[PDB]
Amino acid sequence: HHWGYGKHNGPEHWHKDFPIAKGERQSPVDIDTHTAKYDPSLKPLSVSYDQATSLRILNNGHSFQVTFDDSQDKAVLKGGPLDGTYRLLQFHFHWGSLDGQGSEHTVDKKKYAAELHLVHWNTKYGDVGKAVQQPDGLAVLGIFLKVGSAKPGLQKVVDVLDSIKTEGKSADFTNFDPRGLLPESLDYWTYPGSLTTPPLAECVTWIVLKEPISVSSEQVLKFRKLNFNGEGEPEELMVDNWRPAQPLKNRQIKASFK
Ligand SMILES: O=C(CCCCCCC(=O)Nc1ccccc1)NO
Ligand SMILES: [Zn+2]
Protein backbone atom coordinates (compact mmCIF):
# COMPACT_ATOMS: atom_id res chain seq x y z
CA HIS A 1 0.00 0.00 0.00
CA HIS A 2 1.60 3.24 1.04
CA TRP A 3 5.27 2.95 1.74
CA GLY A 4 6.94 2.48 5.04
CA TYR A 5 9.50 0.29 6.82
CA GLY A 6 7.47 -2.86 7.41
CA LYS A 7 7.70 -6.36 5.88
CA HIS A 8 4.96 -5.59 3.40
CA ASN A 9 5.72 -1.98 2.59
CA GLY A 10 9.45 -1.61 3.33
CA PRO A 11 12.52 -0.78 1.30
CA GLU A 12 12.40 -3.97 -0.78
CA HIS A 13 8.95 -2.95 -2.05
CA TRP A 14 9.59 0.71 -2.85
CA HIS A 15 10.71 0.08 -6.43
CA LYS A 16 7.18 -0.88 -7.51
CA ASP A 17 5.91 2.66 -6.89
CA PHE A 18 9.30 4.38 -7.34
CA PRO A 19 11.29 2.58 -10.06
CA ILE A 20 14.25 4.93 -9.47
CA ALA A 21 14.86 2.79 -6.38
CA LYS A 22 17.01 0.59 -8.66
CA GLY A 23 18.67 3.69 -10.23
CA GLU A 24 22.28 4.59 -10.86
CA ARG A 25 22.91 6.93 -7.89
CA GLN A 26 20.81 5.66 -4.98
CA SER A 27 21.46 6.24 -1.28
CA PRO A 28 22.52 5.32 1.31
CA VAL A 29 25.78 3.46 0.53
CA ASP A 30 28.48 1.68 2.47
CA ILE A 31 31.54 3.92 2.78
CA ASP A 32 34.60 1.71 2.28
CA THR A 33 37.18 3.87 4.02
CA HIS A 34 40.12 2.14 2.30
CA THR A 35 38.62 2.76 -1.20
CA ALA A 36 37.50 6.38 -0.65
CA LYS A 37 40.01 8.68 -2.29
CA TYR A 38 41.34 11.79 -0.60
CA ASP A 39 40.53 14.77 -2.91
CA PRO A 40 42.96 17.66 -2.21
CA SER A 41 40.76 19.81 -4.51
CA LEU A 42 37.80 19.76 -2.14
CA LYS A 43 37.36 23.31 -0.79
CA PRO A 44 36.92 23.78 3.02
CA LEU A 45 33.30 23.25 4.10
CA SER A 46 31.32 26.20 5.45
CA VAL A 47 28.46 25.58 7.88
CA SER A 48 26.94 28.98 8.74
CA TYR A 49 24.14 28.33 11.26
CA ASP A 50 24.39 31.45 13.51
CA GLN A 51 21.16 33.02 12.15
CA ALA A 52 19.17 29.81 11.88
CA THR A 53 15.44 30.26 12.76
CA SER A 54 13.74 27.03 13.71
CA LEU A 55 9.97 26.95 13.37
CA ARG A 56 8.34 23.68 14.27
CA ILE A 57 8.92 20.06 15.15
CA LEU A 58 6.76 17.48 13.34
CA ASN A 59 6.06 13.72 13.37
CA ASN A 60 5.49 12.94 9.66
CA GLY A 61 4.85 9.21 10.14
CA HIS A 62 8.36 8.24 8.85
CA SER A 63 10.63 10.31 11.16
CA PHE A 64 10.42 13.53 13.16
CA GLN A 65 11.74 16.75 11.68
CA VAL A 66 12.64 20.21 12.88
CA THR A 67 11.81 22.80 10.23
CA PHE A 68 13.52 26.16 9.64
CA ASP A 69 12.67 29.41 7.92
CA ASP A 70 14.32 29.05 4.50
CA SER A 71 12.81 32.17 2.89
CA GLN A 72 16.17 33.99 3.25
CA ASP A 73 19.89 33.04 3.49
CA LYS A 74 19.93 32.58 7.33
CA ALA A 75 21.40 29.11 7.84
CA VAL A 76 23.45 27.96 4.84
CA LEU A 77 25.92 25.30 3.77
CA LYS A 78 28.62 26.15 1.22
CA GLY A 79 32.09 25.00 0.20
CA GLY A 80 33.26 21.42 0.24
CA PRO A 81 32.16 19.78 -3.00
CA LEU A 82 29.35 22.34 -3.45
CA ASP A 83 29.03 25.14 -5.99
CA GLY A 84 26.82 27.90 -4.67
CA THR A 85 24.71 28.33 -1.57
CA TYR A 86 22.42 25.76 0.04
CA ARG A 87 19.78 26.83 2.58
CA LEU A 88 18.88 24.73 5.61
CA LEU A 89 15.27 23.56 5.41
CA GLN A 90 15.01 20.90 8.07
CA PHE A 91 16.72 18.16 9.99
CA HIS A 92 15.51 14.73 10.97
CA PHE A 93 16.85 11.38 12.12
CA HIS A 94 16.84 7.71 11.22
CA TRP A 95 17.33 5.21 14.07
CA GLY A 96 17.09 1.61 15.16
CA SER A 97 15.28 -0.65 17.56
CA LEU A 98 18.67 -1.52 19.12
CA ASP A 99 21.92 0.40 19.39
CA GLY A 100 23.70 -1.72 16.76
CA GLN A 101 21.53 -0.57 13.88
CA GLY A 102 19.74 2.59 12.76
CA SER A 103 22.08 4.46 10.46
CA GLU A 104 21.54 4.57 6.71
CA HIS A 105 25.12 5.01 5.61
CA THR A 106 27.57 2.50 7.01
CA VAL A 107 31.33 2.78 7.43
CA ASP A 108 33.22 -0.38 6.54
CA LYS A 109 29.84 -2.14 6.99
CA LYS A 110 29.52 -0.72 10.59
CA LYS A 111 26.03 0.54 11.45
CA TYR A 112 25.57 3.31 13.98
CA ALA A 113 22.61 3.70 16.35
CA ALA A 114 21.17 6.60 14.34
CA GLU A 115 21.91 9.12 11.62
CA LEU A 116 21.04 12.87 11.53
CA HIS A 117 20.30 14.46 8.17
CA LEU A 118 20.50 18.28 7.84
CA VAL A 119 18.72 18.95 4.57
CA HIS A 120 19.73 21.97 2.45
CA TRP A 121 18.58 23.09 -1.02
CA ASN A 122 20.45 24.95 -3.76
CA THR A 123 19.21 28.55 -3.90
CA LYS A 124 19.79 28.77 -7.61
CA TYR A 125 16.63 26.70 -8.05
CA GLY A 126 14.43 29.01 -6.02
CA ASP A 127 12.38 26.44 -4.07
CA VAL A 128 12.93 22.90 -2.71
CA GLY A 129 10.39 21.36 -5.11
CA LYS A 130 12.32 22.60 -8.13
CA ALA A 131 15.62 21.62 -6.46
CA VAL A 132 14.54 18.03 -6.04
CA GLN A 133 14.26 17.81 -9.84
CA GLN A 134 17.95 18.70 -10.31
CA PRO A 135 21.04 16.52 -9.96
CA ASP A 136 22.66 19.10 -7.67
CA GLY A 137 19.49 20.30 -6.03
CA LEU A 138 20.09 19.24 -2.40
CA ALA A 139 23.02 18.96 -0.05
CA VAL A 140 22.49 16.69 2.95
CA LEU A 141 24.90 16.74 5.88
CA GLY A 142 24.86 13.28 7.45
CA ILE A 143 26.04 12.79 11.03
CA PHE A 144 26.29 9.44 12.79
CA LEU A 145 25.09 8.95 16.35
CA LYS A 146 26.68 6.45 18.74
CA VAL A 147 25.45 5.69 22.23
CA GLY A 148 27.64 6.81 25.12
CA SER A 149 27.71 10.23 26.75
CA ALA A 150 24.72 12.55 26.31
CA LYS A 151 24.62 15.27 23.68
CA PRO A 152 23.48 18.37 25.62
CA GLY A 153 22.48 20.14 22.42
CA LEU A 154 20.05 17.32 21.57
CA GLN A 155 18.13 17.44 24.87
CA LYS A 156 15.67 20.20 23.91
CA VAL A 157 14.60 17.99 20.96
CA VAL A 158 14.20 14.80 23.01
CA ASP A 159 12.21 16.61 25.69
CA VAL A 160 9.42 17.65 23.29
CA LEU A 161 9.04 14.26 21.57
CA ASP A 162 6.21 13.32 24.04
CA SER A 163 4.16 16.08 22.43
CA ILE A 164 4.51 14.70 18.85
CA LYS A 165 4.12 11.01 19.58
CA THR A 166 1.95 10.09 16.60
CA GLU A 167 1.81 10.82 12.91
CA GLY A 168 0.59 14.33 12.06
CA LYS A 169 1.39 15.96 15.39
CA SER A 170 3.45 19.11 15.45
CA ALA A 171 4.61 21.68 17.98
CA ASP A 172 6.23 25.11 18.08
CA PHE A 173 10.02 24.66 18.18
CA THR A 174 11.61 28.11 18.07
CA ASN A 175 15.12 29.26 18.96
CA PHE A 176 16.73 25.82 18.51
CA ASP A 177 20.41 26.08 17.57
CA PRO A 178 21.48 23.20 15.30
CA ARG A 179 25.14 24.02 15.94
CA GLY A 180 24.69 22.02 19.14
CA LEU A 181 24.29 18.84 17.01
CA LEU A 182 27.66 19.07 15.21
CA PRO A 183 30.81 17.12 16.13
CA GLU A 184 34.15 18.88 16.55
CA SER A 185 35.61 17.89 13.20
CA LEU A 186 34.06 18.65 9.81
CA ASP A 187 36.16 15.97 8.02
CA TYR A 188 33.79 14.27 5.56
CA TRP A 189 33.16 11.85 2.75
CA THR A 190 31.11 12.97 -0.23
CA TYR A 191 29.36 11.30 -3.16
CA PRO A 192 26.36 11.95 -5.49
CA GLY A 193 23.23 10.16 -4.37
CA SER A 194 19.55 10.34 -3.66
CA LEU A 195 16.81 10.80 -1.14
CA THR A 196 16.63 7.75 1.12
CA THR A 197 12.80 7.83 1.31
CA PRO A 198 10.31 7.88 -1.57
CA PRO A 199 10.35 9.46 -4.04
CA LEU A 200 14.09 8.51 -3.94
CA ALA A 201 14.94 11.41 -6.28
CA GLU A 202 18.54 11.49 -7.45
CA CYS A 203 19.15 15.07 -6.45
CA VAL A 204 21.48 14.93 -3.42
CA THR A 205 25.14 15.72 -2.90
CA TRP A 206 25.80 13.72 0.25
CA ILE A 207 28.33 15.03 2.76
CA VAL A 208 28.79 12.47 5.54
CA LEU A 209 30.89 13.50 8.53
CA LYS A 210 33.57 11.06 9.73
CA GLU A 211 33.22 11.94 13.43
CA PRO A 212 30.03 10.66 15.08
CA ILE A 213 28.29 12.50 17.87
CA SER A 214 27.62 10.64 21.11
CA VAL A 215 24.12 10.62 22.55
CA SER A 216 22.99 8.85 25.68
CA SER A 217 20.95 5.69 25.96
CA GLU A 218 18.15 7.75 27.51
CA GLN A 219 18.18 10.17 24.53
CA VAL A 220 17.87 7.42 21.85
CA LEU A 221 15.22 5.54 23.98
CA LYS A 222 13.04 8.62 23.66
CA PHE A 223 13.30 8.42 19.85
CA ARG A 224 12.05 4.83 20.06
CA LYS A 225 8.86 5.88 21.93
CA LEU A 226 7.53 7.71 18.86
CA ASN A 227 4.87 6.02 16.74
CA PHE A 228 4.54 5.50 13.01
CA ASN A 229 0.77 5.34 13.46
CA GLY A 230 -1.64 8.21 13.98
CA GLU A 231 -3.54 8.77 17.28
CA GLY A 232 -6.09 5.86 17.59
CA GLU A 233 -4.50 3.21 15.33
CA PRO A 234 -2.67 0.06 16.45
CA GLU A 235 0.53 1.31 18.12
CA GLU A 236 3.61 0.54 16.03
CA LEU A 237 6.80 1.96 17.45
CA MET A 238 8.77 4.30 15.12
CA VAL A 239 11.96 2.25 15.05
CA ASP A 240 14.13 0.99 12.19
CA ASN A 241 13.17 3.81 9.84
CA TRP A 242 16.35 3.38 7.83
CA ARG A 243 16.96 2.26 4.24
CA PRO A 244 19.88 -0.21 3.89
CA ALA A 245 22.97 0.44 1.79
CA GLN A 246 22.43 0.42 -1.97
CA PRO A 247 24.83 -0.53 -4.79
CA LEU A 248 27.59 2.00 -5.33
CA LYS A 249 27.48 1.41 -9.14
CA ASN A 250 29.57 3.89 -11.12
CA ARG A 251 30.47 6.21 -8.25
CA GLN A 252 33.57 7.13 -6.27
CA ILE A 253 33.39 8.34 -2.71
CA LYS A 254 35.80 11.19 -2.05
CA ALA A 255 37.34 12.04 1.33
CA SER A 256 38.16 15.61 2.53
CA PHE A 257 40.96 14.24 4.73
CA LYS A 258 43.94 11.87 4.54
O1 LIG B 1 16.15 11.32 1.91
C1 LIG B 1 16.60 11.67 2.99
C2 LIG B 1 17.45 12.91 3.14
C3 LIG B 1 16.96 14.07 2.32
C4 LIG B 1 15.49 14.39 2.55
C5 LIG B 1 14.92 15.45 1.65
C6 LIG B 1 13.62 16.07 2.15
C7 LIG B 1 13.38 17.45 1.63
C8 LIG B 1 12.11 18.09 2.17
O2 LIG B 1 11.89 18.19 3.37
N1 LIG B 1 11.26 18.55 1.22
C9 LIG B 1 10.87 17.94 0.00
C10 LIG B 1 11.08 16.60 -0.26
C11 LIG B 1 10.68 16.06 -1.47
C12 LIG B 1 10.05 16.84 -2.41
C13 LIG B 1 9.83 18.18 -2.15
C14 LIG B 1 10.24 18.73 -0.94
N2 LIG B 1 16.38 11.02 4.11
O3 LIG B 1 15.46 9.98 4.13
ZN1 LIG C 1 17.01 11.26 6.05
mmCIF file of C-alpha atoms in Angstrom, residues 1-246:
data_model
loop_
_atom_site.group_PDB
_atom_site.id
_atom_site.type_symbol
_atom_site.label_atom_id
_atom_site.label_comp_id
_atom_site.label_asym_id
_atom_site.label_seq_id
_atom_site.Cartn_x
_atom_site.Cartn_y
_atom_site.Cartn_z
ATOM 1 C CA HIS A 1 0.000 0.000 0.000
ATOM 2 C CA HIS A 2 1.604 3.238 1.043
ATOM 3 C CA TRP A 3 5.268 2.950 1.737
ATOM 4 C CA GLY A 4 6.936 2.480 5.041
ATOM 5 C CA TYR A 5 9.503 0.290 6.823
ATOM 6 C CA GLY A 6 7.472 -2.856 7.413
ATOM 7 C CA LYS A 7 7.699 -6.361 5.880
ATOM 8 C CA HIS A 8 4.960 -5.595 3.395
ATOM 9 C CA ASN A 9 5.719 -1.976 2.591
ATOM 10 C CA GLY A 10 9.452 -1.614 3.330
ATOM 11 C CA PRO A 11 12.523 -0.780 1.303
ATOM 12 C CA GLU A 12 12.397 -3.967 -0.782
ATOM 13 C CA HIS A 13 8.949 -2.947 -2.048
ATOM 14 C CA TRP A 14 9.592 0.706 -2.845
ATOM 15 C CA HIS A 15 10.709 0.080 -6.432
ATOM 16 C CA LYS A 16 7.180 -0.878 -7.510
ATOM 17 C CA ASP A 17 5.908 2.662 -6.893
ATOM 18 C CA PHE A 18 9.300 4.383 -7.339
ATOM 19 C CA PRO A 19 11.288 2.579 -10.057
ATOM 20 C CA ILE A 20 14.248 4.932 -9.473
ATOM 21 C CA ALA A 21 14.861 2.793 -6.376
ATOM 22 C CA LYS A 22 17.008 0.590 -8.662
ATOM 23 C CA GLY A 23 18.665 3.690 -10.234
ATOM 24 C CA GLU A 24 22.282 4.593 -10.860
ATOM 25 C CA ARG A 25 22.909 6.931 -7.894
ATOM 26 C CA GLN A 26 20.814 5.659 -4.978
ATOM 27 C CA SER A 27 21.457 6.237 -1.285
ATOM 28 C CA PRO A 28 22.523 5.318 1.313
ATOM 29 C CA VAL A 29 25.783 3.458 0.528
ATOM 30 C CA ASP A 30 28.477 1.679 2.469
ATOM 31 C CA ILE A 31 31.538 3.920 2.779
ATOM 32 C CA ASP A 32 34.598 1.710 2.275
ATOM 33 C CA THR A 33 37.180 3.875 4.016
ATOM 34 C CA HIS A 34 40.121 2.136 2.300
ATOM 35 C CA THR A 35 38.616 2.763 -1.199
ATOM 36 C CA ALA A 36 37.501 6.376 -0.653
ATOM 37 C CA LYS A 37 40.008 8.675 -2.288
ATOM 38 C CA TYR A 38 41.341 11.790 -0.599
ATOM 39 C CA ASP A 39 40.528 14.768 -2.908
ATOM 40 C CA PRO A 40 42.956 17.663 -2.209
ATOM 41 C CA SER A 41 40.761 19.809 -4.511
ATOM 42 C CA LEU A 42 37.800 19.758 -2.137
ATOM 43 C CA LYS A 43 37.362 23.315 -0.787
ATOM 44 C CA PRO A 44 36.916 23.778 3.015
ATOM 45 C CA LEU A 45 33.302 23.246 4.098
ATOM 46 C CA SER A 46 31.323 26.196 5.452
ATOM 47 C CA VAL A 47 28.464 25.577 7.878
ATOM 48 C CA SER A 48 26.938 28.976 8.738
ATOM 49 C CA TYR A 49 24.143 28.334 11.256
ATOM 50 C CA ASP A 50 24.394 31.446 13.509
ATOM 51 C CA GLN A 51 21.156 33.024 12.155
ATOM 52 C CA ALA A 52 19.170 29.806 11.879
ATOM 53 C CA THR A 53 15.444 30.257 12.756
ATOM 54 C CA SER A 54 13.744 27.027 13.711
ATOM 55 C CA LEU A 55 9.972 26.953 13.372
ATOM 56 C CA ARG A 56 8.341 23.678 14.267
ATOM 57 C CA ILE A 57 8.915 20.056 15.147
ATOM 58 C CA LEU A 58 6.755 17.478 13.340
ATOM 59 C CA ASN A 59 6.057 13.716 13.368
ATOM 60 C CA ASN A 60 5.493 12.938 9.656
ATOM 61 C CA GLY A 61 4.848 9.213 10.139
ATOM 62 C CA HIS A 62 8.361 8.237 8.850
ATOM 63 C CA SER A 63 10.626 10.307 11.163
ATOM 64 C CA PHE A 64 10.419 13.530 13.164
ATOM 65 C CA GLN A 65 11.744 16.753 11.685
ATOM 66 C CA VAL A 66 12.643 20.209 12.883
ATOM 67 C CA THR A 67 11.814 22.804 10.226
ATOM 68 C CA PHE A 68 13.515 26.160 9.641
ATOM 69 C CA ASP A 69 12.667 29.415 7.916
ATOM 70 C CA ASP A 70 14.322 29.048 4.499
ATOM 71 C CA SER A 71 12.805 32.170 2.891
ATOM 72 C CA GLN A 72 16.172 33.991 3.249
ATOM 73 C CA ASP A 73 19.893 33.038 3.488
ATOM 74 C CA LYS A 74 19.926 32.576 7.326
ATOM 75 C CA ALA A 75 21.404 29.109 7.842
ATOM 76 C CA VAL A 76 23.447 27.963 4.837
ATOM 77 C CA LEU A 77 25.925 25.299 3.770
ATOM 78 C CA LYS A 78 28.624 26.153 1.217
ATOM 79 C CA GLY A 79 32.085 25.000 0.200
ATOM 80 C CA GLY A 80 33.263 21.419 0.239
ATOM 81 C CA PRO A 81 32.163 19.783 -2.999
ATOM 82 C CA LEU A 82 29.349 22.337 -3.454
ATOM 83 C CA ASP A 83 29.033 25.135 -5.986
ATOM 84 C CA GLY A 84 26.819 27.901 -4.673
ATOM 85 C CA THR A 85 24.714 28.334 -1.567
ATOM 86 C CA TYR A 86 22.425 25.759 0.037
ATOM 87 C CA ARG A 87 19.782 26.835 2.576
ATOM 88 C CA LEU A 88 18.883 24.731 5.611
ATOM 89 C CA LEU A 89 15.271 23.563 5.413
ATOM 90 C CA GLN A 90 15.008 20.896 8.070
ATOM 91 C CA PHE A 91 16.719 18.165 9.989
ATOM 92 C CA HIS A 92 15.506 14.731 10.970
ATOM 93 C CA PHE A 93 16.846 11.382 12.121
ATOM 94 C CA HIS A 94 16.840 7.705 11.223
ATOM 95 C CA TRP A 95 17.330 5.211 14.072
ATOM 96 C CA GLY A 96 17.092 1.612 15.164
ATOM 97 C CA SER A 97 15.279 -0.652 17.557
ATOM 98 C CA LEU A 98 18.666 -1.525 19.116
ATOM 99 C CA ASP A 99 21.923 0.403 19.392
ATOM 100 C CA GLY A 100 23.696 -1.716 16.757
ATOM 101 C CA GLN A 101 21.526 -0.566 13.876
ATOM 102 C CA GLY A 102 19.737 2.593 12.758
ATOM 103 C CA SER A 103 22.078 4.459 10.463
ATOM 104 C CA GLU A 104 21.536 4.572 6.711
ATOM 105 C CA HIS A 105 25.119 5.011 5.612
ATOM 106 C CA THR A 106 27.571 2.503 7.012
ATOM 107 C CA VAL A 107 31.330 2.781 7.431
ATOM 108 C CA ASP A 108 33.219 -0.379 6.537
ATOM 109 C CA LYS A 109 29.844 -2.141 6.990
ATOM 110 C CA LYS A 110 29.517 -0.716 10.593
ATOM 111 C CA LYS A 111 26.026 0.536 11.449
ATOM 112 C CA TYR A 112 25.567 3.313 13.977
ATOM 113 C CA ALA A 113 22.605 3.705 16.354
ATOM 114 C CA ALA A 114 21.173 6.596 14.341
ATOM 115 C CA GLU A 115 21.905 9.119 11.625
ATOM 116 C CA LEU A 116 21.042 12.866 11.530
ATOM 117 C CA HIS A 117 20.298 14.461 8.175
ATOM 118 C CA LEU A 118 20.503 18.276 7.844
ATOM 119 C CA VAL A 119 18.718 18.951 4.570
ATOM 120 C CA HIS A 120 19.726 21.966 2.448
ATOM 121 C CA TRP A 121 18.583 23.087 -1.021
ATOM 122 C CA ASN A 122 20.448 24.951 -3.761
ATOM 123 C CA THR A 123 19.205 28.548 -3.900
ATOM 124 C CA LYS A 124 19.795 28.774 -7.612
ATOM 125 C CA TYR A 125 16.633 26.696 -8.053
ATOM 126 C CA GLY A 126 14.428 29.014 -6.017
ATOM 127 C CA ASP A 127 12.381 26.440 -4.072
ATOM 128 C CA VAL A 128 12.929 22.897 -2.715
ATOM 129 C CA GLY A 129 10.392 21.356 -5.114
ATOM 130 C CA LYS A 130 12.320 22.598 -8.131
ATOM 131 C CA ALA A 131 15.623 21.622 -6.457
ATOM 132 C CA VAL A 132 14.542 18.033 -6.040
ATOM 133 C CA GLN A 133 14.258 17.812 -9.840
ATOM 134 C CA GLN A 134 17.954 18.700 -10.309
ATOM 135 C CA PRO A 135 21.037 16.521 -9.962
ATOM 136 C CA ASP A 136 22.657 19.099 -7.672
ATOM 137 C CA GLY A 137 19.489 20.298 -6.032
ATOM 138 C CA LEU A 138 20.088 19.240 -2.396
ATOM 139 C CA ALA A 139 23.024 18.961 -0.048
ATOM 140 C CA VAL A 140 22.491 16.690 2.947
ATOM 141 C CA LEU A 141 24.900 16.738 5.884
ATOM 142 C CA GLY A 142 24.859 13.279 7.451
ATOM 143 C CA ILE A 143 26.039 12.794 11.034
ATOM 144 C CA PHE A 144 26.292 9.440 12.787
ATOM 145 C CA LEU A 145 25.090 8.952 16.354
ATOM 146 C CA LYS A 146 26.677 6.452 18.738
ATOM 147 C CA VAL A 147 25.447 5.685 22.231
ATOM 148 C CA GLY A 148 27.642 6.808 25.119
ATOM 149 C CA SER A 149 27.708 10.226 26.747
ATOM 150 C CA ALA A 150 24.720 12.551 26.314
ATOM 151 C CA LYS A 151 24.623 15.272 23.679
ATOM 152 C CA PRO A 152 23.478 18.367 25.623
ATOM 153 C CA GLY A 153 22.480 20.141 22.420
ATOM 154 C CA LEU A 154 20.047 17.324 21.572
ATOM 155 C CA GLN A 155 18.126 17.444 24.874
ATOM 156 C CA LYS A 156 15.675 20.197 23.908
ATOM 157 C CA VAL A 157 14.599 17.992 20.958
ATOM 158 C CA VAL A 158 14.204 14.804 23.009
ATOM 159 C CA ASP A 159 12.213 16.609 25.694
ATOM 160 C CA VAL A 160 9.425 17.652 23.295
ATOM 161 C CA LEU A 161 9.037 14.264 21.569
ATOM 162 C CA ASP A 162 6.211 13.317 24.040
ATOM 163 C CA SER A 163 4.156 16.076 22.431
ATOM 164 C CA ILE A 164 4.510 14.697 18.850
ATOM 165 C CA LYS A 165 4.124 11.008 19.579
ATOM 166 C CA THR A 166 1.946 10.085 16.597
ATOM 167 C CA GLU A 167 1.812 10.821 12.914
ATOM 168 C CA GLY A 168 0.594 14.327 12.062
ATOM 169 C CA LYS A 169 1.394 15.957 15.391
ATOM 170 C CA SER A 170 3.453 19.108 15.449
ATOM 171 C CA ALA A 171 4.606 21.683 17.981
ATOM 172 C CA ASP A 172 6.229 25.109 18.076
ATOM 173 C CA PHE A 173 10.024 24.664 18.177
ATOM 174 C CA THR A 174 11.609 28.105 18.073
ATOM 175 C CA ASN A 175 15.118 29.255 18.957
ATOM 176 C CA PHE A 176 16.728 25.823 18.509
ATOM 177 C CA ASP A 177 20.407 26.082 17.566
ATOM 178 C CA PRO A 178 21.483 23.198 15.300
ATOM 179 C CA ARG A 179 25.135 24.025 15.940
ATOM 180 C CA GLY A 180 24.690 22.018 19.138
ATOM 181 C CA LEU A 181 24.290 18.843 17.012
ATOM 182 C CA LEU A 182 27.663 19.066 15.205
ATOM 183 C CA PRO A 183 30.809 17.120 16.129
ATOM 184 C CA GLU A 184 34.154 18.877 16.555
ATOM 185 C CA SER A 185 35.610 17.887 13.201
ATOM 186 C CA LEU A 186 34.056 18.646 9.813
ATOM 187 C CA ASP A 187 36.156 15.975 8.021
ATOM 188 C CA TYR A 188 33.791 14.266 5.562
ATOM 189 C CA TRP A 189 33.165 11.849 2.747
ATOM 190 C CA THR A 190 31.112 12.966 -0.232
ATOM 191 C CA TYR A 191 29.365 11.302 -3.162
ATOM 192 C CA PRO A 192 26.358 11.953 -5.489
ATOM 193 C CA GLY A 193 23.229 10.164 -4.373
ATOM 194 C CA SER A 194 19.548 10.344 -3.665
ATOM 195 C CA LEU A 195 16.813 10.803 -1.140
ATOM 196 C CA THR A 196 16.629 7.748 1.118
ATOM 197 C CA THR A 197 12.801 7.830 1.307
ATOM 198 C CA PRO A 198 10.308 7.883 -1.565
ATOM 199 C CA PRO A 199 10.350 9.458 -4.040
ATOM 200 C CA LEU A 200 14.088 8.510 -3.939
ATOM 201 C CA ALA A 201 14.943 11.412 -6.276
ATOM 202 C CA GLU A 202 18.540 11.487 -7.453
ATOM 203 C CA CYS A 203 19.146 15.070 -6.453
ATOM 204 C CA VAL A 204 21.479 14.932 -3.423
ATOM 205 C CA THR A 205 25.139 15.721 -2.905
ATOM 206 C CA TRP A 206 25.800 13.720 0.252
ATOM 207 C CA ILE A 207 28.327 15.035 2.763
ATOM 208 C CA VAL A 208 28.788 12.466 5.535
ATOM 209 C CA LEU A 209 30.894 13.496 8.531
ATOM 210 C CA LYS A 210 33.571 11.064 9.725
ATOM 211 C CA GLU A 211 33.220 11.942 13.432
ATOM 212 C CA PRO A 212 30.027 10.660 15.083
ATOM 213 C CA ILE A 213 28.293 12.504 17.867
ATOM 214 C CA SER A 214 27.619 10.645 21.107
ATOM 215 C CA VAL A 215 24.116 10.623 22.554
ATOM 216 C CA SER A 216 22.988 8.853 25.683
ATOM 217 C CA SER A 217 20.953 5.693 25.957
ATOM 218 C CA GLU A 218 18.151 7.752 27.507
ATOM 219 C CA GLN A 219 18.177 10.171 24.532
ATOM 220 C CA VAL A 220 17.874 7.422 21.854
ATOM 221 C CA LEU A 221 15.217 5.540 23.980
ATOM 222 C CA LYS A 222 13.037 8.620 23.657
ATOM 223 C CA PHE A 223 13.297 8.418 19.847
ATOM 224 C CA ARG A 224 12.050 4.826 20.057
ATOM 225 C CA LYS A 225 8.865 5.883 21.927
ATOM 226 C CA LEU A 226 7.530 7.706 18.858
ATOM 227 C CA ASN A 227 4.867 6.022 16.737
ATOM 228 C CA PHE A 228 4.542 5.503 13.007
ATOM 229 C CA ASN A 229 0.768 5.339 13.462
ATOM 230 C CA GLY A 230 -1.643 8.214 13.981
ATOM 231 C CA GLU A 231 -3.545 8.771 17.277
ATOM 232 C CA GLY A 232 -6.088 5.863 17.589
ATOM 233 C CA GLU A 233 -4.497 3.213 15.329
ATOM 234 C CA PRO A 234 -2.670 0.059 16.448
ATOM 235 C CA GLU A 235 0.529 1.309 18.116
ATOM 236 C CA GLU A 236 3.609 0.540 16.026
ATOM 237 C CA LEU A 237 6.802 1.964 17.450
ATOM 238 C CA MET A 238 8.770 4.301 15.121
ATOM 239 C CA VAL A 239 11.964 2.248 15.047
ATOM 240 C CA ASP A 240 14.131 0.994 12.188
ATOM 241 C CA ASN A 241 13.165 3.809 9.837
ATOM 242 C CA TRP A 242 16.353 3.382 7.834
ATOM 243 C CA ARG A 243 16.965 2.257 4.244
ATOM 244 C CA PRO A 244 19.880 -0.213 3.886
ATOM 245 C CA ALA A 245 22.973 0.442 1.795
ATOM 246 C CA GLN A 246 22.432 0.416 -1.966
#
